[PDB]
Structures are given as structure tokens and as C-alpha cells.
């Protein structure tokens, strides 16, 4: 009975950090959108130069 | 004698699951794993 | 306990009781054993087949879930009996007995004259023997027994004499009626031991056997008090062909086993000569001890468990059989030489003591160290066991130390303390008397003190709640800790989240059980089991109430909601049967009925008097809520399980006559025992009075109001026309217009009838069935409605829970702690 139940918390501690993965996944698209925004901010200035 | 016979197996066997449950746990706790590698590598992607 | 419900499910799967094969297979699947290992597979199969046959009373070869549950109930009551047989309670130190006389010298010996009660202590190097009380260590006389050091002091009942043997080669028999030396007898040698032997046979004269330094037992008849014979000893002078029988060292002790007519002599040579006292010749010589044996006792607990117990220079006690030469048993764990072995008469308890104050109490049925005692004595000189009316150990050391048995102080009481509550575990077929120290379980059939679950919690046990299956006792402590303890042996199987360090005023176990309905139609990925959601609702001296989840393993996360429903301590919680609404009461005069699943509060409309709600209980199955206040008011409200306001209906002035002043004052109802069988309310009175109201009229009126509401609803629904609806919706833009509809009135019909609930319900609607006046010595703490037997066990501050039979309400029983069931006035037959 003890060894049928020690499995529980030990397995539960296996992984609880998917929150970090999801947060940084959102950050990934955040940076992607920043990429395009700043690309446009560069290109508009490129054109005005000429 | 018969009671001690009906109790010797009770003294011995359940050690079988005593070992079995721990052995099953062996590969169970293991999966502090590739999800973390993913979180590390996608973090690298974030960096760039 | 986790697979209890799964086993129940599989057993019910049979529908006609599990036969041998399914029975064994179900327990094999569910058991925490090795199914794949043939050894325990077959052993458990055999054990379960034996269980099946035992359960087989009908003899048809079918064990129903009913039979299995009944057997589990019997085993739970036996576990309640927290010994599994012959409770061997630990020898606690005598809080009431200690040495009083100024022993000018160390205690040498102590012989307790049970016949005289003369605990004659022979002081080391002291020429006077101080006879104390074995029950109070009260010295009677400090009388000069002899001229020099006294070795032994034995009682000769045959002449009412206290014989004292001294190194001066004298023996003085003193008339115990006056403690004057009746006879002084000179001896050629000093006898180290001196024991009165009164063998069982009527024709054998009583012999005071004295074992001196010569190893020869000098035999003095207790009448003339003079030597008449010498038993075999190490006598090198008598050099002849006689076989060496006896001991080569001075006789340390003489043990008259009158049952076997055996004079047992233990010598320094490690021999124990069993001499035939009929002939005084050697019947045997027990051997196996490493050094001189000094103390011998004769554990006669059972004829099949008879054991001589020998101790001495050896640090361990040897168990011996009259036939079996080899030492039967050896009590271990002793760190130093054992002073001796005692076999308490009338109990299986054998006490073996080391020189360092370490005592082991063993069960001769198993010879296991049932108890461990650390006597506060730097050096212990001897010990004597008093078995007269009390199991006490008197340790003769630097002081007269006393240890006492743990018998219940007031047996007739359901407990030595307040009988706080009564639980009718109809499943257990027993009454559980909750008391401050512990929750005591009592066989309903016999009323015996079954379980004394001492230490069930870190605090006193003030609440005991039966499980929905009546298989687990929920205990809440004043510290704020709740837990589930198996009602079998008082083990705290689980705990819940702690309160805010406040005593749990009330604990309830509401189990939302999911009905078994066949479902057709669905396409989704949701594999969720139909678990039965059990929640312990706990109220304390706080505005917050904890809803712990039994299904939730974590005690802290058990609290599915920390819900604030009242402005003060929640006096009581009452779960309305067949509903999720539980009514909580507080001294502020406000009652809040909250839905556990929805956690929504519906406050009862303020009564004419917001008296501190003392006891709140739903008139189950009626939609009626009854609240007894501190001022003797029992308010009955039409509580609706839906969103309809729980409507106040009546307020009966609960009046119980004062025992002393004869004045019927306002007495808060300490407990409300709603016997749904009688529709009756057992109101507990601080005078211990089991007042009894008939709620039939009020319940009928509330039911008829329900019927009127239902009929009105049906009539309203019967006149519904048909209308069409618009198509495709859309374009939103909902505006706000509140006041453009405040000028539409002047149409009222049938509006003043349902608002007269207060007078529609009259105090006459609540009949007063009876009054068990003086039903308890003090306030009745509880009244458990043992509905099945038309029974109700009232708990009160009298420390008793008296059985009161609804047919008469008379006190047909009173759970009596002591095993004196004859005095236990339990007329209950199941």
C-alpha cells in the first residue's frame, strides 16, 4: 500500500512548468510582430531617403 | 503448522509487489524531461 | 479504504451476491497483494474462501454485499475494542500513591500482605519493619522485628502472623491484629528467603519455607512456627551415594506453587529445583539461566498458557513449563539484570523489571512487551504487585513508587468526561459516545464500551460525525483540524485543511451522490468518472466555513470553498437531506442556507427575535428548518431548496421546567434530535432533560403549503398560449430604459395568503410529546436519534449517554464505560 501510493506525489512533481513554455511561446510571436513592425519602420525611412 | 504454512507465503510474497511498485515508479518520476529542452530551445528562438 | 467503493461496486455488479469465484477474484483485483505470485494468490484465495464460508449463513453459497458489510461492521466494532481481546491497559504511574514515611535507610524488601493489606517494608540495615499501605504507602507500625538486618517478611494466614526472619538467626511471628511478636524461634542458620506455602490440598499443613545460605529449606509449620524439617541442599558433609539434587548456593527464594504442589527454589548455580512439596523431593531442575536466579512468578492466566517466569542475574526472563523442560519464552529488550518477574493475577500481564527502572509489561498470550514503563528511580530495590480491586505496581526504591492501571474512573458513565455526542452508526449496529478526550463507540445491542479512541486528534474530540456509509468517523478538534478516522480502530486515515486556529463548531458530511441513469447521445472527448462528491462542511468560531473535499486527497486543498456566511462564529450546521443546501446558524441571530455545490447563500428572513441560534437542524425530509436559540425559542421556517426565500413559519416557546426552582425558564436547546420516524424533536435541556416535541402538525402544514404552491404553478402553466419568434437575430444595440415602466399598477389578486406563514403556523402545530425530566445530570450535549430501533441516546455533561426509548422515551439504556455490562442498563436487543 505504501509503495502503491508513493508513486503519486513523485510522479506529480514530474513536470509543472508548461506555463513557462506557453509564456515564452507568446513572447515568440510578440517578438515576431515586433520584427515586422520595425521592418516597416526601417523601410519607410529607406524610401524617404531616396 | 498449517497456519504457519498459510502465513509463510504471506511473509514472503508481497515483497514481490513491494519491489514491483518501486520498480514501476523508477521510470515514472523520470519525465522531468524534453518539455524542458523545448522550453530552453524556444527560449533561444525568443533570444534571436 | 480507497478501494472500498470500488469493491462495493464490483460486489453489487453480481446483483445476487458474489459466489466464491467472483468474490475471490474481486478481492484479488482490488487487494494490495501479488496477484501474479502463486503463493499469496492461493493463500489469499483460501483466506477469502474461508471468509466466504463464514459469511455463508443462508448456506446457499452466496455472500451478498449486505453480509459482507455486516461482517465488516462486526470487525469494526471488534477493532473499536482496542485490544482485539482482553484490553491490557498500560500501567500508569500512581498519581495518588507515593512514599510518606522517612525511611532512614534504603528499602531492602517489601512484602505486600494482601490478606492484611500490610505492605510490610523491611528497611535495609533498619531493625524495624515499616508496614505501609500497598494502595497508599501508609506505614502502620515501625516495630523492631529482630536484633539485626531482616531478610524476609512473609504473612502466615494460618496464625494471622507476620513472620520476619533476621540475620540474628531468629524468626519473629507478630500477631497482625496487634503487631506484637507472637513467637520468636531460633535457627542454626540465617534463611535468606522465607515464604508461606499453603498448598492447595486441604490435608497438607501450611509450611513457612525458609531458604538460608546453606540452600536447605527449613520448614516451619505456621501453627507452632518452629522448624520440623530440612529440604535438600548443597551439603558436602553428607558425602554418600545420594544424587546431587538441590542447589550449591544459598536459597534466594522459595516459591510455593500450590496448584502443582511444587516448592520452587532458584539458586546462584542457575538451577531451579522443583521440589515435590508433598515429598519435598526434586520433581525437576529447570536450567538454562546464565547466573543465579533470584525471582520466580507463576503466570496462571490460562491453563493452556501457564508459564513459570524466572529472572535474576540474567538480564532476561525465562519462561518454563512443568512438563516442557526447555524455557518456553524469553522476554527481551531488558538492558540490565532483571529484579524479577511478576504475573499479575486475573490478567495476562507479566511485568519484568531491570535494575535501571525499566519495566516491560508482556501479554502471556503472546509474551510481547505490550507496555514500557520508565519509573523515576535511580535504583530499584524490589517490587510488589497489588491486584486487589486495582492493578498496581509498588516499586521499592529510594522512595515508595506506585503505578496504577488505566481503568475508567466512572464506569457507568459513557466516559470519564462529558458525553459530548451520540452517533447512531446503524451500519455499525452500535452507539458512539463522543466525549472531550475521545469519541467512544458502544455496541448498540450490548451498550458495552467498545472503542475508546483516545488520541484521535491533537486536541479533544468534540465532534464525531458518521460517514454517509457510516464507515468513517469525521473528527474536528478545537485547534481547527478536521480528519477522517476509520471507526474500526480509531486510526486517523486522513486529515483536512486546518481552520484559522479556531475550534470547529460543527462538522457535517454532505455527499453529492450521482444517480445511476443510462445516458444516450454524445460525441466528445471527456472520460471523467462519476465520482461521488463528498464534502465535509465545517464551521468554527469564525465568520468563515470550510468546505473540505473528501475526494480531494490534500487536506489543505480539501477546502473547496472558504465561504463567509455569518458575522460571528457559526453555532451549528445542518445538512438538509436530499439537497445541497445546508443551514448555518450564528449568535447574531442570522441563519444562512448555502448551496454547497453553488456556494450561494439564502438568508432566512429576520425572525421577530434575532436570538443567538444555538441548534439548527432541517426538518428532513420536510422543507422545514428548526433553530433553537439561547432564550428557549424554537423557530420553524419554510426553507425552500430552490431560490424561493426560505420563509419563516412559526416560533414555539420551548419551555422546560427548572428542577430546583420549579420555574419554566427560557433554556436554550443544547441539542435537537429530529426523529423523522416520530416526526419528533428531542430537545436537550441543561438539566439533562430530554424534552420531546411532536412536529407532525408543522410538517403537515409545510407539506400542504408545498402542495398549494405546486398546484398554483400547475394552474398558471395550464394557460400558456403559443407565439412565434423573430428570425436570424442580429444588429444588437440593446438600449437601457428603467423608469418607463414604473407607472403600471392597480391589479392585485390572491396576494395576502402566502404571506401569513407566521400565523398559519401556530405553536399548537408543534406538539410536546414528552419530557424525560432530569434525563441527564447536566445539560444534554446531544440526542442521537437511533431511528431504526425507535431509540435515542442522549449525551450530556453528566459524562453519560443514556438510552431513551421513543416508545416511552424512558432511559432504557446508559452506555457504561466499565465492562460491567450487568450494571450497564442496556436493555437493547438487536
Curated annotation (Swiss-Prot), chain A:
Subcellular location: Cell projection, Cilium
Residue ranges of coiled coil: 1-34
TM helices/strands, residue ranges: none
Subunit structure: Forms a heterodimer with CFAP57C. Associates with components of the nexin-dynein regulatory complex (N-DRC) and the CFAP184:CFAP263 complex.
Family: Belongs to the CFAP57 family.
Function: Associates with components of the nexin-dynein regulatory complex (N-DRC), a key regulator of ciliary/flagellar motility, and might act as an inner dynein arm (IDA) hub or linkage.
UniProt protein name: Cilia- and flagella-associated protein 57 A
Interval of the full protein contained in this chain: 1046 to 1095 of 1293
Swiss-Prot record, chain B:
Cell location: Cell projection, Cilium
Signal sequence, renumbered to the chain: none
Assembly notes: Forms a heterodimer with CFAP57A. Associates with components of the nexin-dynein regulatory complex (N-DRC) and the CFAP184:CFAP263 complex.
Function: Associates with components of the nexin-dynein regulatory complex (N-DRC), a key regulator of ciliary/flagellar motility, and might act as an inner dynein arm (IDA) hub or linkage.
Family: Belongs to the CFAP57 family.
Protein name: Cilia- and flagella-associated protein 57 C
Annotated organism of origin: Tetrahymena thermophila (strain SB210)
Range covered out of full length: 1019 to 1066 of 1308
Curated annotation (Swiss-Prot), chain C:
Domain of life: Eukaryota
Swiss-Prot/TrEMBL WD repeat ranges: 102-142, 145-184, 189-230, 246-285, 288-330, 333-372, 414-452, 565-604, 608-647, 664-703, 775-814
Ligand binding (Ca(2+)): 56, 58, 60, 62, 67
Spans through the membrane: none
Subcellular location: Cell projection, Cilium
Gene Ontology terms: cellular component: cilium
Recorded GO MF terms: calcium ion binding
UniProt keyword terms in alphabetical order: Calcium, Cell projection, Repeat, WD repeat
Disulfide pairings: none
Family to which this protein belongs: Belongs to the CFAP337 family.
Oligomeric and partner information: Associates with components of the nexin-dynein regulatory complex (N-DRC) and the CFAP184:CFAP263 complex.
Known function: Associates with components of the nexin-dynein regulatory complex (N-DRC), a key regulator of ciliary/flagellar motility, and might act as an inner dynein arm (IDA) hub or linkage.
UniProt-recorded name of the protein: Cilia- and flagella-associated protein 337 A
Organism: Tetrahymena thermophila (strain SB210)
Phylogenetic placement of the source organism: Eukaryota, Sar, Alveolata, Ciliophora, Intramacronucleata
The encoding gene: CFAP337A
Full-sequence range covered: 36 to 865 of 1079
Amino acid at each position: 500500500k505504501e509503495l502503491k501510493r508513493d508513486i503519486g506525489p513523485k510522479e506529480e512533481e514530474i513536470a509543472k512548468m508548461k506555463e513557462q513554455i506557453a509564456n515564452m511561446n507568446s513572447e515568440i510571436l510578440h517578438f515576431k510582430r515586433t520584427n515586422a513592425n520595425l521592418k516597416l519602420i526601417v523601410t519607410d525611412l529607406r524610401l524617404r531617403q531616396e | 503448522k498449517k497456519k504457519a504454512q498459510d502465513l509463510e507465503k504471506f511473509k514472503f510474497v508481497l515483497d514481490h509487489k513491494i519491489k514491483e511498485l518501486k520498480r514501476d515508479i523508477v521510470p515514472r518520476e523520470d519525465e522531468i524531461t524534453k518539455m524542458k529542452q523545448e522550453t530552453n530551445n524556444m527560449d533561444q528562438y525568443l533570444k534571436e | 479504504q480507497k478501494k472500498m467503493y470500488i469493491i462495493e461496486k464490483q460486489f453489487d455488479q453480481s446483483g445476487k451476491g458474489l459466489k466464491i469465484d467472483e468474490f475471490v477474484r474481486v478481492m484479488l483485483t482490488h487487494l494490495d497483494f501479488d496477484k501474479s505470485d502463486v503463493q499469496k494468490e492461493d493463500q489469499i484465495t483460501l483466506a477469502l474462501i474461508d471468509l466466504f464460508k463464514e459469511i455463508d449463513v443462508n448456506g446457499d453459497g452466496t455472500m451478498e454485499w449486505e453480509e459482507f458489510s455486516d461482517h465488516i461492521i462486526s470487525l469494526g466494532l471488534l477493532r473499536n475494542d482496542r485490544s482485539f481481546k482482553n484490553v491490557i491497559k498500560n500501567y500508569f504511574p500512581s498519581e495518588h500513591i507515593k512514599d510518606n514515611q522517612k525511611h532512614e535507610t534504603p528499602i531492602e524488601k517489601i512484602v505486600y500482605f494482601d490478606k492484611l493489606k500490610y505492605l510490610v517494608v523491611l528497611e535495609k540495615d533498619s531493625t524495624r519493619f515499616k508496614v505501609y499501605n500497598a494502595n497508599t504507602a501508609e506505614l502502620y507500625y515501625e516495630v523492631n522485628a529482630h536484633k539485626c538486618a531482616v531478610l524476609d517478611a512473609e504473612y502466615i494466614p494460618d496464625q494471622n502472623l507476620i513472620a520476619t526472619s533476621s540475620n540474628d538467626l531468629t524468626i519473629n511471628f507478630w500477631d497482625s491484629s496487634f503487631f506484637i511478636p507472637k513467637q520468636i524461634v531460633s535457627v542454626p542458620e540465617i534463611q535468606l528467603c522465607m515464604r508461606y506455602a499453603k498448598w492447595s490440598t486441604q490435608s497438607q499443613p501450611t509450611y513457612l519455607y525458609t531458604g538460608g545460605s546453606d540452600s536447605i529449606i527449613h520448614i516451619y509449620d505456621t501453627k507452632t512456627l518452629k522448624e520440623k524439617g530440612t529440604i535438600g541442599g548443597w551439603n558436602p558433609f553428607f558425602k554418600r551415594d545420594s544424587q546431587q539434587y538441590g542447589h550449591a548456593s544459598p536459597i534466594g527464594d522459595i516459591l510455593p506453587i500450590n496448584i502443582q504442589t511444587t516448592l520452587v527454589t532458584a539458586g546462584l548455580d542457575a538451577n531451579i529445583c522443583l521440589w515435590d512439596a508433598a515429598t519435598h523431593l526434586p520433581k525437576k531442575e529447570l536450567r538454562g539461566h546464565e547466573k543465579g536466579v533470584y525471582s520466580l512468578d507463576w503466570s496462571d492466566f490460562s491453563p493452556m498458557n501457564q508459564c513459570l517466569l524466572s529472572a535474576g542475574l540474567d538480564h532476561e526472563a525465562f519462561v518454563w513449563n512443568t512438563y516442557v523442560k526447555e524455557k518456553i519464552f524469553l522476554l527481551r529488550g531488558h538492558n540490565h539484570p532483571l529484579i524479577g518477574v511478576k504475573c499479575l493475577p486475573g490478567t495476562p500481564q507479566v511485568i519484568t523489571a531491570d535494575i535501571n527502572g525499566m519495566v516491560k509489561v508482556w501479554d502471556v498470550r503472546n509474551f510481547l512487551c505490550m507496555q514500557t514503563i520508565n519509573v523515576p528511580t535511580d535504583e530499584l530495590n524490589s517490587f510488589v504487585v497489588t491486584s486487589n480491586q486495582k492493578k498496581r505496581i509498588i516499586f521499592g526504591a529510594r522512595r515508595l513508587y506506585y503505578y496504577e492501571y488505566d481503568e475508567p474512573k466512572d464506569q457507568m458513565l459513557t466516559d470519564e468526561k462529558m458525553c459530548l455526542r451520540v452517533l447512531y452508526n446503524s451500519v455499525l449496529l452500535c452507539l458512539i459516545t463522543l466525549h472531550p478526550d475521545c469519541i467512544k463507540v458502544w455496541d448498540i445491542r450490548t451498550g458495552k464500551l467498545q472503542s475508546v479512541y483516545r488520541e484521535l486528534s491533537t486536541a479533544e474530540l468534540t465532534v464525531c460525525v458518521l460517514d454517509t456509509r457510516k464507515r468513517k468517523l469525521f473528527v474536528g478538534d478545537a485547534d481547527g483540524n478536521i480528519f477522517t478516522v476509520n471507526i474500526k480502530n480509531g486510526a486517523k486515515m486522513k486529515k483536512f485543511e486546518k481552520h484559522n486556529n479556531r475550534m470547529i463548531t460543527d462538522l457535517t458530511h454532505w455527499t453529492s451522490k450521482k444517480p445511476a441513469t443510462i445516458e444516450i447521445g454524445g460525441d466528445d472527448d471527456d472520460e471523467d468518472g462519476t465520482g461521488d462528491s463528498r464534502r465535509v462542511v465545517s464551521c468554527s468560531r469564525e465568520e468563515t466555513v470550510f468546505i473540505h473535499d473528501e475526494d480531494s486527497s490534500d487536506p489543505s486543498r480539501s477546502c473547496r470553498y472558504k465561504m463567509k456566511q455569518h458575522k460571528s462564529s457559526v453555532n451549528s450546521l445542518s445538512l438538509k437531506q436530499d439537497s445541497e443546501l445546508f443551514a448555518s446558524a450564528s449568535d447574531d441571530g442570522n441563519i444562512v442556507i448555502t448551496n454547497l455545490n453553488s456556494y450561494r447563500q439564502e438568508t432566512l428572513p429576520s425572525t421577530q427575535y434575532p436570538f443567538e441560534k444555538k441548534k439548527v437542524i432541517f426538518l428532513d425530509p420536510y422543507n422545514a428548518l428548526v433553530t433553537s436559540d439561547s432564550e428557549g425559542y424554537v423557530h420553524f421556517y419554510c426553507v425552500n431548496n430552490g431560490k424561493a426565500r426560505t420563509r419563516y413559519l412559526l416560533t414555539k416557546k420551548y419551555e422546560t421546567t427548572s428542577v430546583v426552582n420549579n420555574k419554566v425558564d427560557k433554556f436554550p436547546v443544547t441539542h435537537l434530535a429530529f426523529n423523522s420516524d416520530n416526526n419528533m424533536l428531542l430537545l436537550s435541556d441543561e438539566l439533562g432533560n430530554v424534552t420531546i416535541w411532536d412536529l407532525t402538525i408543522f410538517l403537515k402544514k409545510l407539506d400542504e403549503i408545498k402542495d398549494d404552491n405546486i398546484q398554483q404553478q400547475k394552474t398558471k402553466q395550464a394557460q400558456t398560449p403559443l407565439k412565434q419568434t423573430p428570425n436570424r437575430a442580429s444588429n444588437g444595440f440593446f438600449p437601457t430604459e428603467l423608469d418607463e415602466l414604473k407607472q403600471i399598477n392597480e391589479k392585485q389578486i390572491s396576494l395576502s395568503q402566502m404571506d401569513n406563514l407566521e400565523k398559519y403556523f401556530q405553536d399548537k402545530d408543534i406538539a410536546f410529546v414528552h419530557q424525560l425530566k432530569g434525563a441527564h445530570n447536566d445539560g444534554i450535549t446531544w440526542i442521537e436519534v437511533l431511528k431504526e430501533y425507535n431509540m435515542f441516546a442522549t449525551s450530556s455533561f453528566d459524562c453519560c449517554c443514556h438510552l431513551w426509548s421513543f416508545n416511552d422515551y424512558k432511559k432504557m439504556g446508559s452506555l457504561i464505560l466499565g465492562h460491567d455490562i450487568m450494571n450497564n442498563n442496556w436493555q437493547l436487543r438487536v
